[PDB]
């Protein structure tokens, strides 16, 4: 399937799924073709200009015929749906036929985009990012989350309606179980979240994967927050469905693997990663993720330089003692 571009007015780096390429100014680029049909996809832009944020559109090829057209008034590329199949079905071949359209590659050995999106569903995307008129979803670097806006009209479509996760909240902590529920988050995970909201492991994972991708592609603060929170919730729970645990190490591994170096200190949360990997209940269940993290980001995790120049809260208070020693 194919996504035509009416034109390429301005110099821009274009990304589709895990791939990226540049288009110069008024180079004859008329879109992408041979897009594998099965997946949700994302097409994202950063202008070479440097005035622009990172922005992009999530879509499903099956739900429509989608095209990109630059908007001078807005000053950015916009996705649109061609309602009439024949007219749209017309635009290619002039562009395929005249070439001028680049081909999505044929997949690497790792089947990467699938591993990143395996649980992501467009209909779920469309409930997080609410713009009911369109069959595709626009996300950019500046979008806040419903959680953040509440804890403080703007367009409701400019808010990311992720599932609200708050570890010190009534929802998370049962009255009369304060210590138990805070130290072991299994009630919040299993009853409140998995059984109550997501209904499925697959839904929970899908949100987690979507949050990561928004965090990576757009450098969206709220998304990174959510992604880490969804990881933390599982790792900080002593009781987790077995099939989720198996799945998690793989999910995280591909995310970390695919992450380019430049976006790492922006995305990654030092505290959460060190907790999950080295002290959480499920630390052992992330063998592969730990290995790759240690390799790609050792400094974040404490791997090794000399002193140039030259507490007890977690221990009991000592009243007095009997001590045998030299002096």
């Amino acid at each position: 399937n194919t996504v035509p571009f009416t034109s390429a007015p301005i110099e821009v780096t274009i990304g589709i799924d895990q791939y990226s390429f540049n288009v110069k100014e008024n180079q004859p680029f008329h879109g992408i073709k041979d897009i594998p049909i099965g997946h949700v996809h994302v097409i994202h832009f950063q202008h070479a200009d440097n005035s622009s944020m990172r922005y992009g559109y999530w879509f499903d090829c099956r739900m429509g015929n989608f095209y990109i057209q630059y908007d001078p008034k807005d000053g950015l590329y916009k996705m649109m749906e061609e309602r009439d199949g024949a007219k749209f079905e017309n635009i290619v071949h002039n562009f395929k036929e005249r070439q001028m359209m680049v081909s999505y590659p044929k997949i690497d050995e790792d089947d990467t985009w699938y591993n990143l999106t395996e649980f992501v569903q467009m209909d779920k995307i469309r409930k997080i990012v609410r713009k009911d008129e369109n069959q595709f979803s626009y996300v950019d670097s500046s979008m806040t989350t419903v959680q953040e806006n509440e804890l403080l009209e703007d367009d409701p479509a400019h808010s990311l309606n992720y599932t609200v996760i708050n570890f010190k909240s009534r929802e998370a902590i049962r009255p009369g179980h304060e210590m138990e529920d805070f130290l072991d988050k299994s009630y919040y995970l299993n009853t409140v979240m998995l059984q109550g909201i997501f209904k499925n492991s697959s839904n929970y994972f899908g949100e987690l994967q979507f949050a990561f991708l928004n965090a990576m592609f757009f450098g969206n603060y709220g998304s990174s927050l959510q992604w880490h929170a969804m990881i933390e919730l599982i790792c900080s729970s002593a009781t987790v469905p077995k099939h989720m645990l198996d799945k998690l190490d793989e999910i995280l591994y591909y995310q970390i693997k695919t992450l380019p170096e430049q976006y790492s200190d922006i995305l990654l949360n030092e505290r959460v990663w060190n907790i999950c990997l080295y002290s959480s209940f499920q630390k052992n269940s992330l063998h592969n993720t730990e290995k790759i993290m240690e390799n790609k980001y050792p400094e974040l995790l404490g791997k090794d330089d000399a002193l140039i120049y030259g507490d007890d809260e977690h221990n009991p208070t000592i009243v007095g003692g009997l001590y045998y020693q030299r002096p």
């Binding site: 500046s142 709220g222 009997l322």
Partner: protein, 1398 residues
């Protein structure tokens, strides 16, 4: 092989035994070995599995020292087959094996050192760090008699070469025979056995048939011993014996017994570092010519080419390197050819290629050599027929400079340094900027602390430093922007880490521009500025490392001075029967090599047994993959040899101080006014990730001066981006998310309107109109419009335009019915953030703007700089407007909710007491004493704890109430469970109060309470939980007896409540009441005992059942308060050695800079002070030693000690007798069944003690065996004092002799025990001496005492017999007392020192 036998015989060497079962020093040797092994892991936080496994193994060993020694000796005795060794050259040996190897290594070095196995010439030596060796050697050459004379055609020759492949070719059968001469042969067999093992290079596994594996922990010992064989071959037995000196009395390095033997041989001097030999020869003319001929025979040089291939020192100018005169050249080869011949190619390979021979002569005025990475050139003062890195060589006889030594860094070490640097840049990543700068600093410091003055003289190394520094900076710049900056503020590189800088240390000429020295401040009154003014170069210069490191010469000269001073001070203290005191040497603490400080460290006693420590450290390169660059000094042995703290201070000053530095940063955008430092294994090695670093410095990095030609405006904001600076754009996008720019503008405008509506009548305002404005107007940075339009009851008389704080605008010239306001927002950089100059320019531009449409000519433009949190306004004014706006702007800047969000967002990006007495009802919660314990460290270490009642201390600071909840013992991952229990209880208290009385704040003394207490307080959203910075002494609440008593007695959970303030509020205000309270409490913390003397010391002024404190007058209160007030500081003076200083308070800050020393009869107070001596029991230290079944442990029971200290005194010694009967079936075991209080005379120093008591009449006296006496003392020592000894003869020399002395040390808070077994020679000496009152007396010697096993039990109780009279203390009745009396006895209850009668 036999050169060694003749030598060892001539030395009468005593072979090292297999370690005895009861070896005296076993536990020390073992701990040193294990500590070495642990040290690898001290720095690192997360250890992978092998590391993690190996550590487990060490800890086992350490945990069971006795079993390990068994474990260890079994292997040495029996284990001859071993695991494979991995290499990478670094060798990894099995961890269980290493322990034995390391134990072996420590034992051998200690024993060899004791037995003087290694002569003075063998190096590296524990005596000196390498640079000091090089100094000693050059001096030593200087002092050779007639060395520099060349009157009679004499020559001096210095041969320097390597013993090639010494380690590699070792033969094991030879080695074993050789080891057997000096060691046990079970040990000789282990060692060689242990070298014969499989070596796994990763894939190949091969067997080590010959050659020494330098990775083995004891390889250093083999290497030096095998070296000695070669030394003997080079030197021959006689000359070796001359150098070493006689075995009974040996010769210090390079010293001789007489001038005559010094001149007896051509070989004046010899040294080996380790692989490298140095030999200094003297020849008279024939002795030289003669030798040259023998050589020229076998190797004749028909055509005079012997000059080609003659190694020379190219690093010196051609005049200062050796001159290739044919004779001198030939003599050189001759000494080489002679020396080469003395050593079999089997033992080593000696080659001309790797040797340097320097000849001093009538034609060569310079003597050259290279040692420990220094290149050295000696020029005698006579021959002087170039001011850098010079040592003055002083003749010891004449006290005058006879030569100069010149230093440079060797080419080979300059390349090493250059590679380190290139490697930093080279290393893979993705490396954080801070990390790169740390690596640079470590390389720099490592080089500078070692070479010091040699660097200044070495020009190529100076240039390499400069290139390196630039390269380091340039890597940071590329990380910041693909494009290289036009200019870059040195502040980002050289600002210290504490302030968010890279903390680079400079070795370059770095000029600080004047434009980087400007800063500003916004005050309530106005905006005020600093700009720099005139300075001399070097006020303009980034400080450099050079001047912060004392030269080796200065260190060495000063060391000679201070160590001589100590010897002298040591002389006199002994002369006055005194032990030398620390203070006496204070102010030479940080001088000398080793530092004088080393004498008074705690581990000093054990370090005594650490021998081979310099060679051991140098050898880590073979057994550890990553090692310290400070391998050449050891702080335990050497002390700290450099201090760079001053550099940090000087850089900050050079950069314009804190205010100027922070102006380059986003600090002002946080909203903080004041700086106090809180960015966020025990220690922090923390580094800033680049994201935060870049945001922090953005104002100085992201500006037009630094980057040009790529200016854009960031969407949805007024921010300008001067380049594609990684991570900055996103950081800012996140900070301004959800259209914050737009919202701030609208929110500020809204606030202004509301305030204006309040002032309609007072300012004659008809109406205030909020214009609705284009959505993006807040960030059109080229044009504007009115945000608020204003109108007029009648008319306004208005000024020409002036700034919001200009003060006499005059209103005459003008009149208009209509005023507007424009609110402008900007985000400034370092280059531009003058909001004042900005609003003026904007106002003037826009109002004459033919595209900006304002309603009228009149108006006021308000400006806020979002980055710098500053504001100002410019425009037309009418009476009473300006003060309204001023107050208004002032309030909105603090309170405005949108700005609050901006600040919070900024603080997150960066990863960032008067109040207390206000109306809000606030509480303090301390849980320090909630779960609390008592401790029983065994000698071994599975260290149990017992849990005793605790308390939640909740208090109303304003009003002094106290809700103490007693955490009964029933209740008990435990210390954590403490927190959740506390939180639960506090929230339960709070539930009980009705909302009127509920606190608006709860302050937790300790941070770990914050999370539990939030969680328990979710139902109370209005209550803030705040942590604190202060240290608050509530923990000391349990030094208050009324309190301690309630909790400790308490048999169940309860809430007991008090008023800690005790009605002071009656007169006093709350603020003060705290202040007493704090005072009262900190003191107790400081000395539970010194404090309580101050409140039981005047019994008549006393405390009612209602209150916890005496019922004091107000002045004496002012007096009582007065005394403590210093004491806090004394503890400060005593612990930090600071006498008096500037009056800055101490509740929140531990320390600050000095160091100027500016500015030039009913007492029977005791009987109190002895009331409080049960305190001293809270902590007991029993001195300990390794068990032996044959040497036997005595046991003491509790009560006996309980009273004993109960009846003891605080200044005067007290004594008794202990009766012991061995337990049945336990011949070795001894129990202290009875203690006998006896009539005595006691002195602080000494005592007079009554004679062995006859128990004979008193009943039940039967079956009991006396074991001894036990006595208190106020000075700790490791030995029985001279007075103790005198009293030991006096009653044991006969008949029994044997009975032990138990000495107790009483120092506030703790009691320290020790038992000694007196020697006969002791026994004899005292018997020579009576009436001793001193610890130290002429001829007194500590050796006399031995340790005897001691213990201490709850498991028994004992019985005490007093004199029948009931009197034991004759201090106040000296005349009544007769030492030689017959006295009778009875079962009874003893009586305190100050029982009324005594």
């Amino acid at each position: 092989s036999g050169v060694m036998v003749e030598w060892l015989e001539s030395r009468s060497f005593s072979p090292i035994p297999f370690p005895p079962l009861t070896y005296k020093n076993d536990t020390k040797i073992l701990v040193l070995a294990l500590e070495d092994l642990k040290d690898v892991y001290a720095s690192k936080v997360r250890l992978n599995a092998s590391e993690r496994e190996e550590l487990a193994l060490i800890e086992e060993a350490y945990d069971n020292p006795h079993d390990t020694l068994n474990r260890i000796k079994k292997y040495l005795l029996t284990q001859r087959v071993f695991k494979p060794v991995d290499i990478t050259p670094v060798y990894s040996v099995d961890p269980l094996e290493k322990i034995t190897d390391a134990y072996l290594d420590q034992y051998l070095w200690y024993e060899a050192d004791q037995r003087k196995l290694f002569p003075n010439w063998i190096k590296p030596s524990d005596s000196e760090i390498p640079p000091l060796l090089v100094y000693k050697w050059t001096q030593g050459i200087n002092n050779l008699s007639e060395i520099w004379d060349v009157s009679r055609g004499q020559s001096a020759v210095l041969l320097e070469t390597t013993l090639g492949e010494m380690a590699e070719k070792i033969d094991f059968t030879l080695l074993n025979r050789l080891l057997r001469l000096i060691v046990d042969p079970n040990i000789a067999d282990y060692i060689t056995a242990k070298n014969n093992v499989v070596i796994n290079f990763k894939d190949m596994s091969h067997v080590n048939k010959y050659g020494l594996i330098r990775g083995l922990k004891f390889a250093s010992f083999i290497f030096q011993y095998y070296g000695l064989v070669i030394d003997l071959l080079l030197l021959g037995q006689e000359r070796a014996t001359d150098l070493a000196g006689p075995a009974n009395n040996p010769n210090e390095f390079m010293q001789f017994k007489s001038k005559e033997v010094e001149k007896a041989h051509p070989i004046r001097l010899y040294t080996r570092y380790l692989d490298r030999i140095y030999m200094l020869f003297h020849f008279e003319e024939d002795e030289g010519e003669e030798l040259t001929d023998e050589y020229l025979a076998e190797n004749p040089d028909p055509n005079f080419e012997n000059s080609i291939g003659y190694n020379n020192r190219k690093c010196w100018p051609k005049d200062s390197r050796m001159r290739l005169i044919r004779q001198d050249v030939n003599l050189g080869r001759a000494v080489f050819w002679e020396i080469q011949s003395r050593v079999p190619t089997s033992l080593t390979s000696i080659k001309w290629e790797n040797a340097f021979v320097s000849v001093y002569s009538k034609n060569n005025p310079n003597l050259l050599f290279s040692m420990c990475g220094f290149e050295v050139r000696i020029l005698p003062r006579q021959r002087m027929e170039n001011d850098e890195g010079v040592w003055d060589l002083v003749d010891e006889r004449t006290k005058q400079r006879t030569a100069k030594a010149y230093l440079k860094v060797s080419e080979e070490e300059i390349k090493k340094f250059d590679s380190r640097i290139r490697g930093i840049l080279m290393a893979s990543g993705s490396t954080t900027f801070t990390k790169v700068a740390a690596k640079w600093n470590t390389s720099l410091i490592s080089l500078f602390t070692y070479f010091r003055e040699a660097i200044v003289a070495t020009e190529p190394l100076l240039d390499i430093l400069v290139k390196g520094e630039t390269r380091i900076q340039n890597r940071v710049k590329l990380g910041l922007n693909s494009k290289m900056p036009t200019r870059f503020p040195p502040a980002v590189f050289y600002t210290p880490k504490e302030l968010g800088g890279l903390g680079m240390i400079s070795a370059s000429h770095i000029l600080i521009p004047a434009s980087d020295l400007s800063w500003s401040k916004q005050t309530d009154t106005g905006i005020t500025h600093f700009r720099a003014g005139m300075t001399h170069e070097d006020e303009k210069l980034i400080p450099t490392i050079f001047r912060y490191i004392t030269t080796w010469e200065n260190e060495f000269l000063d060391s000679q001075r201070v160590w001589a001073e100590y010897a002298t001070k040591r002389q006199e203290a002994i002369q006055q029967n005194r032990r030398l005191a620390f203070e006496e040497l204070e102010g030479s603490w940080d001088r000398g090599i080793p530092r004088i400080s080393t004498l008074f460290q705690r581990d000093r006693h054990t370090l005594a047994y650490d021998r081979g420590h310099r060679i051991r450290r140098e050898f880590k390169q073979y057994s550890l993959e990553r090692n310290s660059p400070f391998w050449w000094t050891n702080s335990h042995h050497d002390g700290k040899l450099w201090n760079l703290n001053a550099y940090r201070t000087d850089v900050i000053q050079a950069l314009g101080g804190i205010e100027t530095i922070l102006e380059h940063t986003l600090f002002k955008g946080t909203g903080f006014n004041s700086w106090e430092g809180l960015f966020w294994q025990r220690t922090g090695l923390s580094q800033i990730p680049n994201r935060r670093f870049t945001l922090w410095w953005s104002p100085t990095i992201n500006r037009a001066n630094v980057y040009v030609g790529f200016l854009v405006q960031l969407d949805l904001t007024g921010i300008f981006l001067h380049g594609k600076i990684p991570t900055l754009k996103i950081s800012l996008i996140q900070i301004f998310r959800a259209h914050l720019w737009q919202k701030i503008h609208e929110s500020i405008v809204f606030d202004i309107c509301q305030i204006l509506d309040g002032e309609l009548d007072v300012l004659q305002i008809e109406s205030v109109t909020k214009e609705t404005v284009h959505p993006r107007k807040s960030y059109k940075m080229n044009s504007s419009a009115a945000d608020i339009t204003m109108e007029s009851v009648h008319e306004w008389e208005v000024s020409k335009p002036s700034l919001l704080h200009e003060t006499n605008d005059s209103f005459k010239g003008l009149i208009t019915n209509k005023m507007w306001f424009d609110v402008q927002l900007r985000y400034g950089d370092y280059d531009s953030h003058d909001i004042s100059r900005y609003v003026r320019a904007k106002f003037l531009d826009y109002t004459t703007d033919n595209v900006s449409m304002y309603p009228s000519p009149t108006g006021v433009m308000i400006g806020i700089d979002l980055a710098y949190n500053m504001y100002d306004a410019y425009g037309n004014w009418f009476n009473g407007l300006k003060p309204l706006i001023q107050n208004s702007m002032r309030t909105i800047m603090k309170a405005n909710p949108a700005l609050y969000v901006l600040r919070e967002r900024i603080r997150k990006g960066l990863q960032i007491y008067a109040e207390l007495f206000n109306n809000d009802i606030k509480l303090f919660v301390d849980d320090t004493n909630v779960y609390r314990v008592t401790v029983h460290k065994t000698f071994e270490g599975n260290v149990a704890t017992k849990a005793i009642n605790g308390c939640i201390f909740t208090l109303n600071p304003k009003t002094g109430h106290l809700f103490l909840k007693i955490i009964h013992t029933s209740v008990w991952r435990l210390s954590q469970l403490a927190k959740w229990k506390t939180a639960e209880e506090v929230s339960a208290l709070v539930r009980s109060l009705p909302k009127e009385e509920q606190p608006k704040q709860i302050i937790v003394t300790r941070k770990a309470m914050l999370d539990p207490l939030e969680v328990h307080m979710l139902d109370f959203p209005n209550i803030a939980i705040r942590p604190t910075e202060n240290r608050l002494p509530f923990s000391a609440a349990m030094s208050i007896d009324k309190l301690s008593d309630v909790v400790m007695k308490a048999t169940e959970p309860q809430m007991v409540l008090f008023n800690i303030y005790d009605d002071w509020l009656d007169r006093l205000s709350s603020y003060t009441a705290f202040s007493r309270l704090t005072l009262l409490l900190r003191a107790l913390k400081t000395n539970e005992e010194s404090a309580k003397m101050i409140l039981l010391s005047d019994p008549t002024i006393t405390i009612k059942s209602y209150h916890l404190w005496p019922s004091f007058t107000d002045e004496q209160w002012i007096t009582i308060e007065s005394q403590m007030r210093d004491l806090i500081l004394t503890e400060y003076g005593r612990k930090y050695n600071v006498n008096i200083s500037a009056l800055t308070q101490t509740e929140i800050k531990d320390i600050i800079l000095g160091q100027n020393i500016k500015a030039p009869n009913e007492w029977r107070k005791s009987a109190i002070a002895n009331t409080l001596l049960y305190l001293r029991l809270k902590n007991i230290y029993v001195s300990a030693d390794d068990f032996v079944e044959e040497q036997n442990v005595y046991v003491l029971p509790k009560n006996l000690l309980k009273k004993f200290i109960e009846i003891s005194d605080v200044k005067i010694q007290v004594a008794a007798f202990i009766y012991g009967m061995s337990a049945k079936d336990h011949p070795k075991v001894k129990e202290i069944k009875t203690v006998v209080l006896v009539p005595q005379l006691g002195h602080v120093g000494s005592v007079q003690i009554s004679n062995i008591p006859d128990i004979g009449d008193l009943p039940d006296t039967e079956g009991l065996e006396l074991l001894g006496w036990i006595h208190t003392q106020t000075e700790e020592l490791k030995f029985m004092a001279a007075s103790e000894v005198a009293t030991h003869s006096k009653l044991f020399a006969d008949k029994k002799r044997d009975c032990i002395d138990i000495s107790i040390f009483s120092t506030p808070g703790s009691v320290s025990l020790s038992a000694y077994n007196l020697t006969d020679e002791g026994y004899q000496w005292g018997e020579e001496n009576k009436d001793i009152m001193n610890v130290l007396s002429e001829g007194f010697e500590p050796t006399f005492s031995t340790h005897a096993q001691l213990l201490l039990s709850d498991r028994i109780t004992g019985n005490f017999i007093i004199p029948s009279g009931n009197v034991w203390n004759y201090t106040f009745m000296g005349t009544a007392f007769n030492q030689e009396g017959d006295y009778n006895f009875k079962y009874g209850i003893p009586l305190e020192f100050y029982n009324e009668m005594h």
